[PDB]
What we know:
Chains B, H: It comes from Mycobacterium tuberculosis (strain CDC 1551 / Oshkosh). Chains B, H: GO terms for molecular function: 5-(carboxyamino)imidazole ribonucleotide mutase activity. Chains B, H: InterPro entries: PurE_ClassI, PurE_dom, PurE_prokaryotes. The structure is a homooctamer. Chain A is of the alpha/beta class. Chain A has a single domain (about 1-165), classed as Rossmann fold, CATH 3.40.50. Chain A has six helices and five strands; from the N terminus they run βαβαβαβαβαα. Chain A has helices at about 15-25, 45-55, 70-80, 95-105, 120-130, 135-160; strands at about 5-10, 30-35, 60-65, 85-90, 110-115. In chain A, helix 1 (about 15-25) runs parallel beside helix 5, helix 2 crosses helix 3 and helix 5 runs antiparallel to helix 6 (about 135-160). The first copy, chain A, starts with a strand and ends with a helix. Chains in contact: A-B, A-C, A-E, A-F, B-C, B-D, B-E, C-D, C-H, D-G, D-H, E-F, E-G, F-G, F-H, G-H. The interface of D and H includes residues 9, 68 and 73 of D.
Amino acid sequence: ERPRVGVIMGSDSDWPVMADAAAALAEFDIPAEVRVVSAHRTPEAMFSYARGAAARGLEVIIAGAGGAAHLPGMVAAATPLPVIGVPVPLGRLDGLDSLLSIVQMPAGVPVATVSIGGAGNAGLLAVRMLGAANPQLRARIVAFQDRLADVVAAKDAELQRLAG
Amino acid sequence: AGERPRVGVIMGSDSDWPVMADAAAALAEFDIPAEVRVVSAHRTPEAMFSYARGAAARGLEVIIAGAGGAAHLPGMVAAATPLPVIGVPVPLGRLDGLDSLLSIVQMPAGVPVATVSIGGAGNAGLLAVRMLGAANPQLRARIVAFQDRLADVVAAKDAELQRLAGKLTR
Amino acid sequence: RPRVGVIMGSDSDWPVMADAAAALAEFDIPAEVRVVSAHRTPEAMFSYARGAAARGLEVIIAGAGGAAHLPGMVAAATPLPVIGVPVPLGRLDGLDSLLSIVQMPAGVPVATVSIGGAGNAGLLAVRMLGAANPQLRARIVAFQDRLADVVAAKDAELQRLAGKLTR
Amino acid sequence: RPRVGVIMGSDSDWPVMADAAAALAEFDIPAEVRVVSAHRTPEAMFSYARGAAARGLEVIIAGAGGAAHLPGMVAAATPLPVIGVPVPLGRLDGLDSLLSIVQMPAGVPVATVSIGGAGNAGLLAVRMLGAANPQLRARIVAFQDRLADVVAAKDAELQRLAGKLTR
Amino acid sequence: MTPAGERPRVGVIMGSDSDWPVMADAAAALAEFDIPAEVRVVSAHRTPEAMFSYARGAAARGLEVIIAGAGGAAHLPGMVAAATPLPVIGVPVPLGRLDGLDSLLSIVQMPAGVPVATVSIGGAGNAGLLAVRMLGAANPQLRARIVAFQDRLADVVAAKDAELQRLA
Amino acid sequence: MTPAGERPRVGVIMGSDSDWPVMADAAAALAEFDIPAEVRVVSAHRTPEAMFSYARGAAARGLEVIIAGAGGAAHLPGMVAAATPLPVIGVPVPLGRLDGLDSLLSIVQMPAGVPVATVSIGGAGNAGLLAVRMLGAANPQLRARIVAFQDRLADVVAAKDAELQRLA
Amino acid sequence: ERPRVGVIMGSDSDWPVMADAAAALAEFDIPAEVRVVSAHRTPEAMFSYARGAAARGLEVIIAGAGGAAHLPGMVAAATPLPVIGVPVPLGRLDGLDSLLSIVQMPAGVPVATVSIGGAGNAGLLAVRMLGAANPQLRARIVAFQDRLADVVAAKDAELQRLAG
Amino acid sequence: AGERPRVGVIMGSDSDWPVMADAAAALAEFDIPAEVRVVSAHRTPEAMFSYARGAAARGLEVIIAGAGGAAHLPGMVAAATPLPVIGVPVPLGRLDGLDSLLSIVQMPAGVPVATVSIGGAGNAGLLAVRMLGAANPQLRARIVAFQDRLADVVAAKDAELQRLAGKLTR
């Protein structure tokens, strides 16, 4: 099946972080693709990727970048699709630069920003976006949430033990 | 006017309204029916939960939630709905909304919030519109038209600024 | 029989929050510990907070990191004093945790301690319990005097160390 | 007859700290207010802290700004719980005040509230006093219920406003 | 100081015309050294196509430096730099919140491969002066004008000091 | 790539030799474009006289750009800029605490009159590339080498993408 | 009498802040001079001022600067005298740049840093430096401190009134 | 060795010693007698006050005080002595000493603290030496000699680095 969500990043070195987005999508059986696309080193490829996304059938793009992180914003500039930006923390500043570079978009072009390093949540957010008007998928999200609660109960059990 | 809402624009206090009104305005620009509410995570946790839990059944497809300071509303609403929640950090008297921003965006693994810029309620509205357009070719074409109009305005401002600079030089 | 609840969003918070349990135990204050997530178990979180007073709790110590909403949401749902411990996560050194907990708008307070300061959250709960209780307040003073005595000893030791260094 | 002390380093702190006095008065908790400077009157500060318990105080709320040492130094000298209010000064928006108050090392806790959050410091003191006192705890719950009722009213009002707007 | 109708040697661009009150200082500095400049609104976020076209076309037109101002998530200087061999000077424009700290970090923190010369928050005047220094690097005559400019800055301080003695 | 014994066109300087592991990347970038460079330890804090002498003597010697790295209260780039007409590129070197935020602010926030071109924290490589861009601004042949460099950066990304498909 | 403390700043626009240092010195009858000396715009003058200070009889230099505030550090680099740096807050960042630019001196060259805008305290610190081995002046500082305490008692009186 | 101290090097906890030892070392380089103490503002406020109040009478001329986190020791010592107090912000487990720095340097009007860099105990020692030298021509000449030696070392490192770079080029 053709991908419905794209997961892109400026470097394969971002994969240790961005892999969680792919994992989250796979948990919900959403067809997805992953790409290295750099705003600064392949601007033409980036522009084409964004412009072509909707026509290819993509519904959401998750983009990760660090430092002066421009990839999410520039992709959002070039597509009508919702874009989720994942701030990737680099060697200095703990992703604070990445975060401000992504989230602080001036009026006109929005980027949905998640936590620093929060690729897993970007995946879950994409799923919620796909679920908004899809009752079947939405029910799957609700089930996922119920199961999350069960995990906490297991952790609480572990804590009782540790506190003994 | 008396339509069923597809998007909820909510906020922790009515003093957030001057900022959050921009989300409502953006939604109206795209003819998306929306409701505006005061829903307090801190002062009305039970009602906050009821709002979130009841949202999807009522036909809401996106919730835009604004709060400032220790801003918990977007996150706690997201915890109680499968719907996508957009969080608007509202800047308060101190810290220029840096506290609002971190308290909204830094959600640990499990529950996501789509966070926009500090004070960025308008962009929250536009983002909800993109979410609604993602699998709706007609609305999506409206979004592209909106984008092209923004671009045309920049070109007009570019020409105007060149003329202004040319005048100063002369 | 617990008088203080020590709760946290994840068992991964325990390396920090254990210090709160330790402090309470040093003053023989009965306590319970729980993993309770505001984000992943909001219903359980709400029930915990709502039921706390009925269950005989007098103080709740809550730890969380990142966008840390647990202390504030618990405080929203109980009349009891809630102490919030900002737990530092992988990035930002708990600055996000701190601001998320301390910056509560008017109406719902959270007593916030230092980043990672679970031990002090325990000591703070003890002070809250001791404010009116004569025996416990005397124990607190004795504890404070003991802290002063260790400082006197460490000071003397440091002086001897530096002395050995020069000689 | 005071049960809570509300102190601050300068009378210039009053525009903020007044909110603490107001909150206490709303719950009919007898309180005293004082200008007590850790830096300019360390002797008076020490005497205030040392004598607090003997004088019948149960909680001290202390506000200071910049390099804000008053809450911590008072807490160092009393077994009572101390609530610290970071007062924002001309630069840094109280971030310096906040870190100076909240980041107490292990041994001496300070319950820290939001920057400028004197009102919440008052509410927090009330919760500490109410934890065990049945009448006061019921007053707190009634207060919380009243807060929820104002939200319901403001929500309805906002909806009517937006309605008028569209129409 | 620069006469009208010269071909530009420096581009002064910004994401929005609301940036002009700030960016005008860059144009003023260039004019003081008689450097022909053009002023443009070029938006990375609202006109990505036009932004790339501007960047790629700059050097061929004889531009030698681009000064770019933007605020918030400030992507213009970086994206322009990605599409031109010319040195790009980024001016962080402070917006309503954060005092241009977001603008600064989003401009200066370019990862390896594409540099941007970043100046102080709101420092458009200094961006202009820096552009002049770039042009002067291999131009002895211009470089001598810069030295004189620096020398005369010292004379101004003498007058300020005189003013201070009076105030004291 | 640059042969030994050429007169330098760019100065790569730093406050301490402990900065070299970072600053070496600037020298490497210059060497890749065959730009002759000298490398120096010049301390604003420990050798103010020598620092001024270096700055004032640079242009006369044929230096066209100075790249200066410093950390903490990083004064070297600014003080050098105050004493030369040449463009100065400041590299914030991150020290043991604060992750080079102090270094960044102390370099970039120059008040009006004396600009410093600031690059990312630890971004010496980019400082070298920026210097090359400055030299290329009016040098069509060098400028064409920069464009090719940019073009080839894209090919590397293609290989990284291939690696990512394998990992996925 | 020849000045014992110099109070310098990069611009006369710093005077609204730095005036407090001069006031503090005058309260203790310490001969002082004030100068506009810019590290960035008059580096030669700055270097001469610092180098010549001790010979002229100066014992302490108070220097104020904002932004990339280099004046205190560069003066300290050029004199053996203790230098007190006053971070002057500019239009953006509330003097956080000024503070880090002054206080974060690497090993070898110290600058005594006071609060952002804290020129008054710089004056008081200079006085304490002069008092360290001058019992008469030190007694004057003690008296000053006693009087400070009296001011607080007056403020406390005012508060009792306001709280009524 | 068994001299009366002229400078006190104090700290809130003995875990600060690894940092503060640099102040003692700098003082020794200039043959300035110094004592090293643990003096806790938070755990021993009475003893802290006694130390500060007794300092000048005992012959101390400068106090160097280090503390981390909510660092109150330098300020509270300064409150209780007419002597100049140098504060060293000691970085703790979180925040890289930014908390230590702000809690020391941001003293409001009335009580000054001479603040040095985060972890900068060595510079604290050197600063105390400058204070002692300000009106002491012999010690001041020693300081100038120290400064010249630092400068000579930089020149040697400069030559060495040029040779290293020359080698790499070759």
